Design a protein around this ligand. Sequence first.
Ligand SMILES: c1ccc2sc(N3CCNCC3)nc2c1
Length: 435
Amino acid sequence: MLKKKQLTVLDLHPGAGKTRRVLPEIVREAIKKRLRTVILAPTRVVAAEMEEALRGLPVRYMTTAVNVTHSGTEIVDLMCHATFTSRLLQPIRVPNYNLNIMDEAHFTDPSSIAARGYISTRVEMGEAAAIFMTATPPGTRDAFPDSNSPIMDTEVEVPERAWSSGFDWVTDHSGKTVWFVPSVRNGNEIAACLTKAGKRVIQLSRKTFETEFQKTKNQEWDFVITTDISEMGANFKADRVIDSRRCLKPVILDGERVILAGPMPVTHASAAQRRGRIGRNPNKPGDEYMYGGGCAETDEGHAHWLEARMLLDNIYLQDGLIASLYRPEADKVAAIEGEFKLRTEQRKTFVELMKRGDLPVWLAYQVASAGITYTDRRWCFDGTTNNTIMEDSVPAEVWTKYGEKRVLKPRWMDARVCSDHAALKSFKEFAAGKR
Ligand SMILES: c1ccc2sc(N3CCNCC3)nc2c1
């Protein structure tokens, strides 16, 4: 697998041992052949599990999630998918890795899709080798793959709001359940209902993931309410998965705004990953998987694939060449390669709005391409009246950096800056000039 111009898809079923058994064997062989190697982890939680599997081997951990003292003589680097893409965009020097290993390579966040595009292009050019590790490669149509022990699959109506009656099976269970919901707000309602019935509930989402995941190990729980982030290697000691089979989808309308469409069906890859949290112990047969809807290919037209092209158009590859998306996922977006390429100064603004501003890729692009500088926030208040952001059924308001109270009305509206309480609080701080 380690020879140039070759990209291998390691598609062993979930729990077949890709991370704890296969990955260290590959790393040993790469060190023996003096291949400059990069290992890409989706989250800091997976990066911690990888250190445990690779203990003793010389690996340079480019993250604060691991507390290790490096020798300085490591030729294997380990970082998150987002860190790799961010370093490529920034003026920092990134080595031309001979071997590129991506764990949980199904991750659909814009930075992950961009990393897959960059790596597969280098492989197509004959410069590097690559290994993509996932049970669900792009375009998979099987939502019920193999497992370490048999699973009981049941199609059933799953509540998406609080309930008083009609779903006794949910609360009559005496084990641990992981429940996948389409949004943070929907998880809040279901968590409140379960807490009122006497259940101990933990909630997980993108922003709270590392902090709250530790609670699944440190304390006793009955239910874990999670968004789609738990599809990326999160391991639980549970006996049941309740899957609404629904997700939200960011959609760019008329090329001028982003809305959060849905809830709508998940892809087969997401359903199989959600089901894959159980049936992992060969000594425990009969874990349950209750699903409340069907699958569909809802990644077509999803804004993350357009955002990945915005990222790839601003990454240097060779002279005027631009990396293409990984071939099995390149048709998810209708886009012209190079159409998002920015000049040096606007590109720096684009990077700072994403890194420091913490804004979505699409929104950072509209601001930077309009010739606006990072600290200029006049655009957060000069949009049309239909762009007014609402908080508790009344327009959201902030004190501008000038000391003036104004209604939040951005020139470009992206639903992700106000999808929950935490998101709107962070966007208000940005509009006020606080970061
Ligand atoms: C050794 C060599 C280079 C880097 S960059 C880095 N970080 C950058 C961003 N993520 C957190 C830490 N850590 C190292 C360690």
